Design a protein around this ligand. Structure first.
Ligand SMILES: CCCCCCCCCCCCCCCCCC(=O)OC[C@H](COP(=O)([O-])OCC(O)COP(=O)([O-])OC[C@@H](COC(=O)CCCCCCCCCCCCCCCCC)OC(=O)CCCCCCCCCCCCCCCCC)OC(=O)CCCCCCCCCCCCCCCCC
Ligand SMILES: CCCCCCCCCCCCCCCCCC(=O)OC[C@H](COP(=O)([O-])OCC(O)COP(=O)([O-])OC[C@@H](COC(=O)CCCCCCCCCCCCCCCCC)OC(=O)CCCCCCCCCCCCCCCCC)OC(=O)CCCCCCCCCCCCCCCCC
Ligand SMILES: CCCCCCCC/C=C\CCCCCCCC(=O)OC[C@H](COP(=O)(O)OCCN)OC(=O)CCCCCCC/C=C/CCCCCCCC
Ligand SMILES: CCCCCCCC/C=C\CCCCCCCC(=O)OC[C@H](COP(=O)(O)OCCN)OC(=O)CCCCCCC/C=C\CCCCCCCC
Ligand SMILES: CCCCCCCC/C=C\CCCCCCCC(=O)O[C@H](COC(=O)CCCCCCC/C=C/CCCCCCCC)COP(=O)(O)OCCN
Ligand SMILES: CCCCCCCCCCCCCCCCCC(=O)OC[C@H](COP(=O)(O)OCCN)OC(=O)CCCCCCCCCCCCCCCCC
Ligand SMILES: *P(=O)(O)OCC(C)(C)[C@H](O)C(=O)NCCC(=O)NCCSC(=O)CCCCCCCCCCCCC
Lengths: 110, 103, 67, 128, 178, 125, 87, 220, 55, 52, 80
């Protein structure tokens, strides 16, 4: 349920960016959208925070409990390690989207 | 390296024809000649039809046809807790024993 | 509202969208702070974790080695 | 220097890395010219028929006709029983049948042995 | 696309195509504009360094080594314009492209809904029918006896003619048809 | 995760406890008089409350009280904080008792190792 | 959605890019100037000019076609033809 | 009768309604996207109601309304499982679909077949609801393959794009290997338990074996 | 937070006027682990080849 | 056909074929919707080794 | 309607990373002629942009003020 919420919102913000930039889907050609597009910027930031498990957003009440249960169970050691690394990589690619789409100077056509 | 004179001339002529063709593709003020033959009100007609008629039909179907045969609608029995009042028989489910309470 | 296209310039923005974005970012941060003020146990835990080293052999029912 | 690229059948060699692209002979140039002339002749024929204002229908493609004929109706006349053909046919047409026969025969023999010995869980198996 | 290809690519053409491809992939690696400008100037410096070279054997060997270097260092996921062959918007509007021969099968009522358009269309059809013989005659007069040696087509040499084989080029569907 | 895993794997698995076989010592071994655990909720009460089979542990009475609280104050979904805390505290006490069982098993195992080493040395000497 | 292109708009944008090119003198640049016959550039300069136009208008000109555009007017005509611009 | 069954079935039915109207002047007009969006909004509210009913007393039901066919000792009927999972996932899915339909009304504004796009979105929603509320394996499989084929149709939305067509067929291929696993599970359950419905499956499988559970895992 | 910090450092490194050829790990990650390439060219090719040459 | 040039004015733009030219025996499996043999940035052997 | 292109003389690389690039190239003995055509991106409303941490804290200032006011009101109500 929680993932339905914030992932749908993230895809809608991505689509808004695509439409405003003439069907461009490359973060290498996005840029400056933090100030260019205020509402989609704040929506995508809130969604990416909720995705990564901000302490009291919609993703905290599921992902945090899942990680707690995985750590506290009689589990596969390799599965536990891969789960933790995947949480780190989730934060990583959310950072990549934000950094390459919204921060910096523009790269889109004039 | 560049256009030959024949390539340049043919491109010029073809582009002139193409522009003329698109200009002809433009429509006329009269062109789509069709043959002869409040916000709350719209959602009020929508709500009665789309919500009211189906709910009437479905409630009639369930109350008088589906639930007229055994085991068609099975409900999970309600939870009963200590110190409860069973409404069916006016019964009283007793409370639990005293907890060994801490702090 | 009609937004005129810009060429090599920052696009025209709207007061409504600026205030809406600011209000919702502020709403998220207020919610996070308000939840942390009240429900801080969800992040930092609620009950202490016992140290098994401090449990006496008498209370764990371990007899002296010689016995 | 840089690691070399090894072409495969499913990842072919790029044209820019082909050694023959940088060793061009005067006969290579005339081969290219002849190929371009063939393409130009075919293109002229197709374009004339294509832009004909009076043509209605399908421009028949002899290449397509030959391809469909070679794929179906010309195979048996040009087939000969060779050792390779016989072995490949025997394998691909007989090996799978006997492999599956052995698999199913063994499985059903085990099932029937368990049934006869009366130690196979057949409870609730009403529908057969 | 619009231009007929030749039998082979010259050495200069190969060098320029490598230059453009290398700059595009360098831009894909160097996401930011300042970094791209810096490294693009360095790349042009390398090309200008080898610009003057009389030994064509050495020039071809340089091109071959440059191609190997490019293949090793190319971006696995280079930037592609949306409408370009690898792009995301490539061939999206092909299902919306319908031909004018499909247009002329309309019912009379449908055609009656657009009286002015179809008069101009009839004028275009008459213009096409009145020129076909001159077009074929011009094509068969100017060809060599062996046949067409290339895919290029001539223009109209006279004041009343049209460039031979022009109908589908001129009346091709629009890039955004619907 | 924890240091017990390192001790068992990169160390003396004979001295460390085995979770899938614990306990291996009698419950009264070293306990002169040991009292059994008390169960407040009865089988019929848990069956009526329709507790999940993994929720029918020794803390089930606080869970039943929490469920009854949440049902009665439905629209106010923030009115059973005390019942939630009572259930959580009972679960915490149960967990620390499990931890005590593990630690008892560990030091009993190492006491047995020491005793058998002492017997082996006495026999050798 | 997006405003349609016009011949004047395309011409303005191409001349704008060319005036922002440093190797072209903006005073003697016209819509009929040849990149090499009367501006003194070379093949690499023309390649960079075409790439700049590709970035400007957001589409790609294939190498077979781009090697022939030796004039801002030729570039304008090519882009108008490709974008179906007639006005 | 309690309003639980009536309101759940009403949500499903009013979802199906605009597909019936896909052969009318409204489907020929430009009000069809807004019509479908309004329908999804109303269905979302009517689904919110039984969620409140469950959140109070934890009420769950199964509705075997229509009997389809009796294969000797196996009875197939149209049954719906309105439990915690269904009554929680339906409002979430409807809320998300409502927002997505509005965003598509803005986003697909220039699409010549926006009405067909909205009809396809509503058909996917219907199949997903069938999947979620299904009480037997056969109805669950109907929803399974329905969402698979709607995904196929919507991925290849632009038919002139070869990449779109390859992507659609690829999705079909992988989901079809999943369906191999699903059908293995269905055959095992019928053969060894004489049932395709979750009640009898759960009652009779005190310890489920590797073969059916691995079939389910492969399908998932 | 460690993922945030490491990703941010790596992304800030992109501004430097330093160019380096990609790594094997980068190629593996960017090309999807080579799974679509190998497993969309090899088994499909063999199945479509058997479907004609043999059957 | 994926390896065939995309910028050329083919008679069949989607199939990337010209009218009258010989058709490969396995065109049915070498269409752009099917098996692709285009060159890849990494060698096929390296791909296999890394994946396995 | 009918937008006007801003005058091209206004685009300069001074006070821009492009002039740092130009200085490095000049030290190396080179020049880049496309400086201004890129220099449009570094001026005007694109001149200053936030950092990654400053982006995450977009509404923290007003959110914290509202939080302090609400905590004060709650404490006031609890006291009286
Ligand atoms: C667009 C619609 C169609 C869509 C499908 C289209 C494609 C298929 C077409 C059909 C193909 C097959 C053809 C078969 C022909 C034979 C027909 C037949 O056998 O019909 C069977 C059957 C008839 O059975 P029967 O044996 O004849 O009668 C048994 C009883 O005696 C009956 O009990 P009774 O005596 O009480 O009778 C009640 C009575 C009266 O009903 C009522 O009273 C009910 C309504 C009560 C309303 C209450 C409120 C009233 C208003 C208020 C009044 C007071 C004032 C208050 C004011 C308040 C103001 C605020 O109504 C009827 O009798 C109606 C019977 C059915 C009539 C229609 C039959 C049409 C056949 C046409 C065939 C044509 C050829 C087809 C093929 C052509 C080629 C394609 O009819 C139906 O099944 C009809 C529908 C049943 C009810 C609705 C069920 C809802 C289920 C919901 C499930 C949701 C699932 C969602 C899943 C997806 C989302 C997840
Ligand atoms: C067969 C092996 C199977 C292994 C299975 C298990 C796999 C586990 C994977 C773990 C994560 C690996 C992440 C890197 C892989 C992708 C690299 C890449 O291409 O990035 C470009 C990509 C950017 O793409 P781009 O902008 O296009 O860049 C293109 C450039 O050309 C730049 O391109 P580039 O290629 O030049 O940049 C890569 C370069 C620079 O990137 C990095 O160094 C990435 C960051 C590595 C961080 C490692 C941990 C550092 C410490 C973290 C904190 C924990 C320590 C304690 C701290 C205090 C705690 C109280 O790194 C390397 O080349 C070294 C190798 C990287 C890691 C390899 C892992 C093993 C697989 C390969 C084995 C063989 C490798 C041989 C060497 C390569 C071939 C010659 O990077 C990112 O977006 C950042 C991702 C990396 C950071 C994410 C956050 C941390 C990740 C988890 C670390 C652990 C956290 C705690 C977990 C829970 C513990 C309980
Ligand atoms: C159980 C039944 C058999 C299962 C294994 C079947 C393997 C072979 C499948 C049939 C071969 C396909 C025949 C012809 C299909 C057409 C091929 C085709 O269309 O091309 C590939 C097409 C598109 O190519 P693109 O890469 O997207 O091109 C991009 C364009 N630039 O994509 C595909 O269809 C690839 C399909 C390859 C199948 C291989 C996958 C097999 C994986 C099985 C692993 C199972 C593990 C599951 C875990 C279970 C846990 C208990
Ligand atoms: C439409 C609206 C029409 C307006 C009038 C409303 C009618 C109100 C109710 C009157 C008619 C209803 C009625 O009484 O007849 C019930 C009648 C059955 O009559 P019985 O004699 O009981 O036969 C045994 C069935 N257990 O019900 C029906 O005919 C079907 C009605 C609802 C079922 C809808 C079927 C959906 C179609 C799905 C296609 C097949 C899917 C496969 C099912 C998979 C199952 C695993
Ligand atoms: C793991 C998959 C195995 C499939 C089934 C197992 C059967 C064995 C595998 C194939 C062996 C032969 C089966 C039929 C194949 C025919 C051979 C063939 O196609 O080539 C014939 C050669 O055959 C002959 O004419 C002589 C007949 C026997 C030679 C080939 C069979 C030898 C097989 C070796 C036996 C096994 C070796 C054991 C090694 C250890 C294995 C555990 C013609 O030669 P060419 O003109 O070059 O045409 C090929 C074009 N590239
Ligand atoms: C088998 C040939 C496969 C050929 C290629 C695939 C083509 C067909 C794909 C669909 C069919 C195969 C996949 C489904 C396998 C079903 C499970 C299975 O094989 O079960 C056999 C055996 C049953 O064990 P059993 O004696 O019932 O023990 C339970 C007692 N409580 O269970 C065991 O022994 C379990 C041991 C692990 C088996 C894992 C297999 C997973 C395969 C999934 C991907 C397939 C592709
Ligand atoms: P214009 O007609 O003036 O063009 C002049 C040319 C170049 C045609 C000359 O007249 C000419 O033919 N000169 C001699 C031939 C020649 O130039 N040979 C050398 C050309 S290749 C060269 O040496 C440059 C290669 C260096 C760059 C390699 C690119 C690889 C990097 C790719 C990286 C991709 C991701 C970063």
């Amino acid at each position: 349920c929680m993932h339905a919420f914030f992932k749908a919102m993230l895809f809608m913000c991505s689509g808004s960016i695509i439409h405003s930039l003439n069907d461009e889907q490359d973060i290498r050609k996005m840029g400056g959208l933090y100030k260019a597009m205020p509402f989609t910027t704040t929506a995508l930031i809130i969604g990416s925070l909720a995705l990564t498990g901000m302490p009291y957003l919609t993703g905290f009440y599921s992902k945090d409990l899942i990680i707690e249960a995985v750590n506290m169970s009689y589990t596969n050691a390799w599965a536990l390690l891969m789960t933790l690394i995947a949480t780190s990589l989730t934060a990583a690619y959310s950072t990549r989207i934000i950094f390459f789409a919204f921060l910096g100077k523009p790269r889109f056509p004039p | 390296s560049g256009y030959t004179p024949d390539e340049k001339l043919r491109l010029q002529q073809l582009r002139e024809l193409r522009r003329r063709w698109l200009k002809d593709q433009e429509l006329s003020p009269r062109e789509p000649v069709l043959p002869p033959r409040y916000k709350t009100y719209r959602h009020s007609i929508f709500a009665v039809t789309h919500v009211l008629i189906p709910v009437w039909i479905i409630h009639y179907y369930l109350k008088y046809h589906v639930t007229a045969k055994p085991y068609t609608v099975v409900e999970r029995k309600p939870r009963i807790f200590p110190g409860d009042t069973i409404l069916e028989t006016g019964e009283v489910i007793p409370l639990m024993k005293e907890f060994p309470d801490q702090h | 509202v009609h937004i005129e296209p810009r060429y090599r310039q920052f696009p025209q923005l709207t007061r409504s969208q600026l205030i809406q974005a600011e209000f919702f970012s502020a709403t998220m941060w207020f919610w996070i702070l308000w939840r942390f003020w009240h429900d801080s146990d969800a992040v930092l835990g609620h009950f202490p974790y016992p140290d098994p080293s401090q449990w006496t052999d008498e209370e764990l029912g371990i007899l002296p080695d010689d016995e | 220097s840089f690691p070399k690229y090894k072409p495969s059948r499913l990842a072919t060699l790029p044209a820019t890395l082909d050694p023959a692209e940088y060793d061009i002979s005067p006969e290579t140039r005339k081969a290219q010219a002849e190929r371009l002339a063939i393409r130009s002749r075919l293109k002229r024929e197709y374009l004339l028929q294509y832009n004909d204002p009076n043509r209605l229908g399908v421009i028949e493609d002899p290449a397509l006709i030959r391809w469909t004929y070679a794929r179906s109706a010309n195979i048996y006349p040009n087939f000969r029983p060779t050792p390779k053909t016989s072995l490949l046919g025997a394998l691909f047409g007989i090996g799978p049948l006997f492999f599956w026969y052995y698999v199913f025969k063994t499985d059903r023999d085990k099932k029937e042995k368990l049934i006869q010995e009366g130690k196979l869980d057949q409870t609730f198996n009403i529908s057969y | 696309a619009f231009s007929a290809p030749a039998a082979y690519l010259t050495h200069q053409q190969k060098v320029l195509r490598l230059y453009k491809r290398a700059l595009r992939h360098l831009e894909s690696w160097c996401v930011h504009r300042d970094k791209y400008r810096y490294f693009a100037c360095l790349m042009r410096a390398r090309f200008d360094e080898h610009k003057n070279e009389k030994d064509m054997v050495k020039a071809t060997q340089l091109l071959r080594q440059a191609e190997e270097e490019f293949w090793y260092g190319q971006h696995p996921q280079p930037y592609i314009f949306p409408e370009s062959p690898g792009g995301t918007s490539y061939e999206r509007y092909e299902c919306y492209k319908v031909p004018e021969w499909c247009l002329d099968d309309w019912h009379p009522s449908e055609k009656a809904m657009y009286p002015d358009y179809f008069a101009k269309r009839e004028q275009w059809k008459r213009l096409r029918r009145e020129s076909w013989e001159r077009e074929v005659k011009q094509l068969q007069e100017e060809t060599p006896p062996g046949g067409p040696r290339t895919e290029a087509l001539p223009p109209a040499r006279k004041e009343g003619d049209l460039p031979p084989l022009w109908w589908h080029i001129v009346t091709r569907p629009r890039e955004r048809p619907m | 995760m924890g240091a017990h895993l390192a001790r068992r794997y990169l160390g003396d698995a004979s001295k460390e406890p085995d979770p899938l076989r614990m306990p291996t010592f009698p419950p009264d071994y070293g306990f002169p008089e040991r009292k059994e655990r008390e169960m407040v909720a009865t089988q019929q009460e848990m069956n009526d409350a329709q507790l999940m089979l993994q929720q029918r542990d020794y803390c089930a009475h606080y869970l039943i009280q929490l469920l009854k609280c949440k049902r009665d104050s439905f629209p106010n979904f923030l009115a059973c904080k005390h019942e939630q805390h009572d259930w959580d505290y009972c679960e915490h006490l149960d967990y620390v008792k499990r931890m005590k069982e593990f630690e008892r098993e560990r030091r009993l195992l190492q006491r047995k190792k020491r005793r058998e080493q002492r017997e082996a040395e006495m026999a050798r000497g | 959605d997006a405003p349609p292109l016009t011949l004047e708009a395309i011409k303005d944008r191409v001349l704008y890019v060319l005036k922002l090119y440093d190797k072209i003198d903006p005073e003697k640049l016209s819509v009929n100037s040849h990149f090499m016959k009367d501006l003194g550039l070379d093949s690499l300069d023309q390649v960079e000019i075409i790439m700049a136009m590709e970035d400007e208008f957001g589409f790609e000109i294939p190498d077979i076609d781009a090697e022939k555009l030796m004039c801002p007017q030729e570039i304008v005509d090519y882009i108008a033809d490709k974008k179906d611009v007639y006005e | 009768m309690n309003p639980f069954a009536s309101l759940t079935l009403t949500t499903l039915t009013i979802l199906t309604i605009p597909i019936m109207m896909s052969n009318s002047n409204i489907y020929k007009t430009n009000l069809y996207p807004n019509y479908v969006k309004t329908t999804v909004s109303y269905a979302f509210t009517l689904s919110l109601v039984p969620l409140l009913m469950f959140m109070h007393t934890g009420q769950e039901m199964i509705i075997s309304n229509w009997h389809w066919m009796t294969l000797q000792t196996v009875e197939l009927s149209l049954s719906f499982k309105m439990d915690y999972f269904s009554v929680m996932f339906i409002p979430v899915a409807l809320f998300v679909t409502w927002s997505i339909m509005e965003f598509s009304m803005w986003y697909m504004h220039s699409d010549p077949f926006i009405n067909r796009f909205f009809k396809y979105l509503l058909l996917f929603l219907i199949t997903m609801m069938i999947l979620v509320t299904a009480n037997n394996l056969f109805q669950l499989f109907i929803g399974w393959e329905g969402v698979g084929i709607m995904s196929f149709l919507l991925i290849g939305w632009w038919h002139g794009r070869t990449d779109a067509n390859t992507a659609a067929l690829q999705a079909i291929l992988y989901n079809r290997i999943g369906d191999i696993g699903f059908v293995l599970s269905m055959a095992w359950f019928l053969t060894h338990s004489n049932a395709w419905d979750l009640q009898q499956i759960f009652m009779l499988n005190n310890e489920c074996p590797n073969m059916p559970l691995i079939g389910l895992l492969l399908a998932a | 937070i460690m993922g945030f910090m490491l990703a941010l450092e790596l992304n800030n490194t992109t501004y430097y006027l330093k160019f380096k050829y990609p790594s094997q790990t980068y190629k593996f990650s960017n090309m999807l682990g080579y799974y679509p390439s190998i497993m969309h060219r090899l088994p499909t090719y063999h199945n479509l080849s058997m479907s004609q040459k043999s059957a | 056909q994926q390896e065939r040039d995309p910028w050329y004015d083919w008679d069949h733009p989607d199939l990337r074929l010209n009218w009258g030219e010989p058709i490969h025996w396995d065109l049915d499996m070498y269409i752009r919707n099917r098996v692709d043999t285009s060159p890849t940035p990494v060698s096929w052997n390296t791909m296999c080794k890394h994946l396995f | 309607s009918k937008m006007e292109l801003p005058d091209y003389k206004q685009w300069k690389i001074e006070g821009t990373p492009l002039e740092t690039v130009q200085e490095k190239l000049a030290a190396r003995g080179l020049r880049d002629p496309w400086g201004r055509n890129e220099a449009w991106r570094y001026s005007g409303g694109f001149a200053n942009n936030v950092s990654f941490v400053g982006a995450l804290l977009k509404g923290f200032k007003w959110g914290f003020a509202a939080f302090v006011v609400a905590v004060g009101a709650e404490y006031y109500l609890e006291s009286q």
